[PDB]
Amino acid sequence: MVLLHKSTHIFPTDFASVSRAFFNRYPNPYSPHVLSIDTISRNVDQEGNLRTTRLLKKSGKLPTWVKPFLRGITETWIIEVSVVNPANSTMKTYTRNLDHTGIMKVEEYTTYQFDSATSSTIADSRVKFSSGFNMGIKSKVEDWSRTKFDENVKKSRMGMAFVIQKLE
């Protein structure tokens, strides 16, 4: 299963301000669930672009209706990868959870591009939710079927035996 979502936003600010804010986004009052963020690697490549990989830890709570299907999950590790190109004022960013991917993988691509004509920075986001676990439903369906079959096999056999004796 794959679900795609997209959104766009315009920050009426320049590239230096938006990109600097991205690197210093935490902490902020809107994301109290971000427990920490570390810079894992950073360098300037041969093309003069800044390459950065960061690691975030975020707490959360599973929806009530999910709890039975899934084990206890209160936090997730997230990788954040970015490339800043000062030549064309473009910053590509990507994030995805590192753990729990067997249950659900959430990948986000958000690009910030400065637009000289409007003196603003446009942010285009694309998020993909992927999973083939189906909340482990297949196995639960198999269990139900196995139990139902066994139950019916016995009831059918014993019921027939009972009736045969009554008539006999």
Partner 1 sequence: NIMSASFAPECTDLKTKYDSCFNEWYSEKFLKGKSVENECSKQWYAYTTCVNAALVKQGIKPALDEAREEAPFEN
Binding site, annotated residues: 26, 58, 148, 152
Binding residues for a 1,2-diacyl-sn-glycero-3-phosphate: 26, 58, 148, 152
In whole angstroms, how close is the CB of 46 to a second copy at the nearest point?
29
Residue 21 interacts, among a second copy, partner 1, none and using kind-specific CB cut-offs from 5 to 8 Å, with a second copy
Q: How far is 70 from 75, CA to CA, in rounded Å?
A: 13
Chain breaks in the chain (C to N over 2.5 A) after: none
The answer to whether the beta carbons of residues 41 and 55 sit under 8 Å apart is: no
Write out the H or E segment, with its range, that includes residue 96. strand 90-97
Helix, strand, coil % (nearest 5) of the chain? Answer: 25, 45, 30
Least Cβ distance, residue 23 to partner 1 (angstroms): 7
Minimum distance from residue 88 beta carbon to a second copy (Å): 20
Task: Draw the binding track, 105-144, toward a second copy (x: CB under 8 A; -: no contact).
Answer: -x-x-x------------x-x-x-x-x--xx-xx-xxx-x
For residue 44, report the phi and psi dihedrals to the nearest 5 degrees: -105, 125
Nearest Cα to 120, choosing from 8, 5, 30, 45? 8
Q: Footprint of a second copy on this chain (CB under 8 A)? A: 1, 3, 5, 7, 9, 11, 13, 17-18, 20-22, 24-26, 28-31, 63, 65, 68-69, 104, 106, 108, 110, 123, 125, 127, 129, 131, 134-135, 137-138, 140-142, 144-146, 148-149, 152-164, 167-168
